[PDB]
Amino acid sequence: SEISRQEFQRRRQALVEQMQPGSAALIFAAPEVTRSADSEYPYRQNSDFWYFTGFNEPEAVLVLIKSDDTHNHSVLFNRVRDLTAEIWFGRRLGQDAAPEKLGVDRALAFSEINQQLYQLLNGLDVVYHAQGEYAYADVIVNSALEKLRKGSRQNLTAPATMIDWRPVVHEMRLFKSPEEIAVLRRAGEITAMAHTRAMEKCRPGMFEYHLEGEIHHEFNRHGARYPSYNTIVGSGENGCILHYTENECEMRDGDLVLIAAGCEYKGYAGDITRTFPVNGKFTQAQREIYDIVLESLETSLRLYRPGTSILEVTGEVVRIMVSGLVKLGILKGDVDELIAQNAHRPFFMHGLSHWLGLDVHDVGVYGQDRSRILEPGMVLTVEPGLYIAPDAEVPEQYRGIGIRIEDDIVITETGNENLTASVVKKPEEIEALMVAARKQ
Amino acid sequence: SEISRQEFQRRRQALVEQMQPGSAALIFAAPEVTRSADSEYPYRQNSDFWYFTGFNEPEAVLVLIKSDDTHNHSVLFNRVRDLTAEIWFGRRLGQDAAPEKLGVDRALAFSEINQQLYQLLNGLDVVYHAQGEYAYADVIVNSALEKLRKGSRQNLTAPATMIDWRPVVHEMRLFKSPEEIAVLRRAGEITAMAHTRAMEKCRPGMFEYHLEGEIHHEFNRHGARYPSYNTIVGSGENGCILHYTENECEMRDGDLVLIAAGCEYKGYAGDITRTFPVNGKFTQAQREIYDIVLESLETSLRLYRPGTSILEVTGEVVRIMVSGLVKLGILKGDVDELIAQNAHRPFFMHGLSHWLGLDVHDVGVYGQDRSRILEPGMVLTVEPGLYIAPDAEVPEQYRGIGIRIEDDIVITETGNENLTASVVKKPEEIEALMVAARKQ
Amino acid sequence: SEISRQEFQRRRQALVEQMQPGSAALIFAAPEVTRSADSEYPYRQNSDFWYFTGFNEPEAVLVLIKSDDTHNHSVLFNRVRDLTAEIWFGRRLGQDAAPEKLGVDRALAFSEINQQLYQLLNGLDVVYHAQGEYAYADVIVNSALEKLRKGSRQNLTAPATMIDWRPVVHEMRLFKSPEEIAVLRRAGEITAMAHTRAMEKCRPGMFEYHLEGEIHHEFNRHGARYPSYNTIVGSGENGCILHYTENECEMRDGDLVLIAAGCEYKGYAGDITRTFPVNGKFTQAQREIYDIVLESLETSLRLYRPGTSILEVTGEVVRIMVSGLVKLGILKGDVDELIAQNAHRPFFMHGLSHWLGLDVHDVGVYGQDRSRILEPGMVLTVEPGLYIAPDAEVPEQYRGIGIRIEDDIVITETGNENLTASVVKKPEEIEALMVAARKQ
């Protein structure tokens, strides 16, 4: 699946619909980024710029002008075409093709932006700009307003009101359209297929990085060239470190392995976590921690629906975890007291769920302590985990265990749809998958 | 292979050996880098910082102080240890472990650098600093010198002489040690193995990006997690674009495919280019252009040795190319005149060779028009190419063809060693390899 | 006269009255300014900061917070008291005295501003700030908003709307109160008294700078320590240069001298220009140019009233000037055509009138081509001039003559009040004043 021109158009109109009359919205592209010396990282367009343009070039600015409640138009600044530059660093849209390709009214050369932008802004009342987002953008916008302010003898005037569009735009991205969901559904399928391959490929003696390569190859072959975030393969005690990306260790028979990987497909992010035995068979100590994390996930998946919140479902997961850990002797005392003492926090120290979208940790307001009432169209992760440090004062068999199980869901009219259930998580189904592969 | 502690030590002493008495050299680490929102790219240490420390953390500064011709010592500023931070973003060396692990005399907290650095610099005559390399570094160094200048009532004084260490350090990196060469030799083997796999895997109907995934998987499985540069898979007319990285097109039976990929192994870069038929069989038009590019490579490999230069070997390649193109009717006129008219340049528009090392386009002085006399220990690429644009006024059969063949060599006492000959380039050996794979 | 506490209070309330509910206005003080090395210029408070505080310290910020339509309060950040610092660089208000002295609700240490300001702004909808006014201020405000934006996990939120208060505040300053006018009336008397002294003191052989010293001494003795702008004493051909401040030349018998000086009294600016013979007797050529400039001034003073504009009165002055210059042969042709050709502009090349107040070139909107309808309370200068360059192609006797006559007026309910008529401008009254002094 993909995002059509029509959808990019609707999004711009949805934004403009909310802008005041006599205003201009300025959305800048991401700068290129050095990796070392003159070699650069693969380009990643700014998410908000991408959201409105589907245009993957740097040195580009969308300008949406609203004259009144029925009049508005779009100017794109982008790089001019250049034979030399393209024979080297590759094709560019240019100005001729831009209006038709991107559905914008006008297209001007980025090199002229300092001589043009202030003219577009002259006489307006409001300018919507994301201050401090990019330095070069602030330079451009401040430079344009200075011309207008100091140029009253040339009958210029600056908009006196600047407004952050980020709250507005991020509220928009918080609610996914059917097109967005179809794309995310596929990023789900692709990411899940990679996690299955990792489970099937893993043998003791392989390195954590070998499963990374397997996952990335799978993303790639389905047309998801880059991951959504730096992949984590934490075997053994490395699984207790939430952002472990060294992936440098030999995987040992007896250890668990926590794999956290996500693809980026048409800009949208998959994000799955699966934990499993390197030797294909859970031990009793591993099962005892795993069944608690799994029940937390399965209950959350039953509970997530419109009307509830992340805060609320989290309360149910806390209860499941404290109760489970008491029964294992990892915690001692009354369950209810232990909850009010947050006794779980040394072992489960992150949130249950985050928004998912163009960014893996997606934009949108959570509300105080994530108490926001969920509504259909919201996409989020469900990711309970338990992490018992190597030197935790608990029964020995639980020390140095890190387990997380993460799924991606979308809130629907009567509950949620699970986008990542195509990769197994029930421990017997994991063990069966892995036994199958060792045959073949 | 790898780089030992001893080697990192020697390098620092080699630098200090050249510093003046009463001086301090300041080498800063690379900053982390955003990819989108709060997710970051995989960390890539500054090459010069890596060269002297083998230390892959940000927020770290090497300070080498030379008191006189026999007295000198090293202070490392690096991040302090922090349980919380490491449970999240992963392990850190800290100050306790640093002196022993990295072979430095002292280790201080980066957070204290503003309160400490000016003390280290007080009373010196010279400070070696790479101005404009990183903004945060310039802020730190300028801030330290301002304290010293304005603090004469506290008996402080600033070094009045600042010197760029980059010329000195890059001259050092231009000459590889036996350890460096062993590492580069393996980056050669790994990169070559990937290009062979790409040749064996390619079928018509596959996308350019599918061969990218095959190459990256191969790098990964040999412990080269990231490439040295953004991989190019240019099939058909896409091969005429020198930095084509979209890799988005279906590969067609009849087209050639130019694959330019390199691994990064222990920090050092492989860089290979191979061009071949998507269907495993060169056409006559393809052979006619390929044999010219290949003869250029084979002659260059015979000629490269101590005493000659890149400029000089390039002259021989120009002659081979002009002569070849005349015989095909791509160029008309006297060969010698055509050379003095640079008639080849529309078709071969980049250099023959670049330095290779910690950076793929490696540091070191080429001399005017790359006329520098080569010496043993120099590592460089040999990469002739011919690119006939789709709309070139030449016989039709040559239009839209892009061919390059690149090998990595090291200059030795009596010639060069080819690090990448383990992947085939003779057209019959390419066709044989590909026929073999299609069986299976 | 002076400005009371009550007036400073009213001004703040007038500003707040116009702010939106749930907003904060941030007004910063001027930075100290180096003259050479470590010696600084006399401090000059930012006019807008002065306008609301009457507080002549740097490192100070007024914060006016509007909670709703009946609730609002003021926090002043200012420098803490310090015995050492004051024994050196002089007294400071501190925080204890500030609420009572300046009539503000709270007073905090400027050194704490980064730790406090974001707390004041948390949860508001609008912040009024003058962007690009001072660099240190922008750093402070951007820093405060970044904390609030990135701090949603600490239940912080930034105002999404920033608004320039300058248009609002400058509209306020455009209309002077009775207190302001009494002060300006005295700045008028003082400035006029200086121009009379200059006329009485001038002999041929004195230098232009000697009359500067006389003027400044007069300002000083009436308690106007500094001038409003750099004083101009342009004798002879130096009078053709509108901002001639070298004042370095010997004044010659036969030349005219244009003196443009203004005092600064309680922050408010006088601005007078008078031109006169260095030898106390106008020649015929001087009278012929002088009578045109004078009639322009006298007619303008009759015409200036509520209902008309500067543009309109300027049209009458153009007519007077073109007609006068035709009769002298300086211009040739029909008067009406010459006006439509702007034939006067080589000789009268600046505006007739500028707003006067806390700044000599005072704030407030002129409207296109200064067409704004005048209203009572507006203070402005009336300053026609004619400047015949030394090499102008006109009759010899007019070359190298520069004459301007400037008065300060305030628009009243039925016309204007002249604040500077206490210094003579009729040529016979100038000559009489000067003859009297020579006795002284």
Next chain:
Amino acid sequence: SEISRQEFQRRRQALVEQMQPGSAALIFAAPEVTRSADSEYPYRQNSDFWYFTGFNEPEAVLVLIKSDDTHNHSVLFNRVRDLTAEIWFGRRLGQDAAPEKLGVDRALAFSEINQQLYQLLNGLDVVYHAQGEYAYADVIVNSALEKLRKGSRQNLTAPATMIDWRPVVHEMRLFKSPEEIAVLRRAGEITAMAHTRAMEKCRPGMFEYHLEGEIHHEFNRHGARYPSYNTIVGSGENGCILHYTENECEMRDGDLVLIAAGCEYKGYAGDITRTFPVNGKFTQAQREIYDIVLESLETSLRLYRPGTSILEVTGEVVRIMVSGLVKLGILKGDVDELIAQNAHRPFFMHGLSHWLGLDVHDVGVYGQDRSRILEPGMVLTVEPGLYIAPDAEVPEQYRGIGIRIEDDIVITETGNENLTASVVKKPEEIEALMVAARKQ
């Protein structure tokens, strides 16, 4: 007196004589400076720029290039001429006149500096630059070096060594030439004449600022338009504040008045302090403190000579002060112990002497605790003072007294010359001068 072209030439050659072969020295002019809105302070050229050019324009850069030990030349960047701009903001030298007027080899337009400077610097080994002196200068120089560094394919190269010229240039300014001394001698005469006038004019009932106006008028009439520093008139308890410039108080019969004023004449600074009774007659308590300060000055003036130091003469002054204060009961205990306890410091808390020159607090190295051996040609102030705070626990009659007496001297071959003895300081000679004036 004044500074000739020849002297400016010698100074440049003296600098070049010390530069390395293959180097360029870059000396930038001062930027204009805002006072309020669009009105600016009187221009004050950077002292070091003035020192080598005698050129009082902004947007100007001296470039001294040293090719070898006998070859060197000067390029001045300065503002181009412009009719419009000069008819407004006044005359400019331009490029045509500059070589002859300023004795430089070449003169280029400042507007071209970014396109030219890097060409001048290309291929050099050293560039002398004052980093952090002015922001615009650092931008220019960093910009020029970046072009050269990144432009090796255009056979450019940057000087790898940057050196601060300030230590070198300030050592030069520390030793005044006969021309400089003649100028300083006159700045002495002028400043002294102002202090005499202040003594003769002062009556009780006058304000501190009235004597400021008298002093400035005197500076002005001798052709010293601006003071060297912000004038201090501290009567009564205001005299205990070392940098008291409010000068806002009525001068009371019975109080002392400390006047600290200095002129700026041809760029060079006078700096005199005199203290005296507002009513022309010292009381006994005033005499008792005054005679200690005066004996300190008179002994210092006998002692200052080549071979001694400021530190050393200061030791003698400490002894005089401690002994004097003991005899008055202001200090109790053994004199020698009290000295080793620095018991004087609450009452005499600044240095005895500072370098004087183009800056009042002039450049040049003092050595640790001002221990530098004095040599002929050094110009410095001699300024002992005693300041008894209003709430000091000492006999009542001494509280709230501030007395300083400052003279300017130049070290000669066999002692010093007093430049400011033309204004009286013996108390009977003060009282006589003041009685004479009252007749006016």
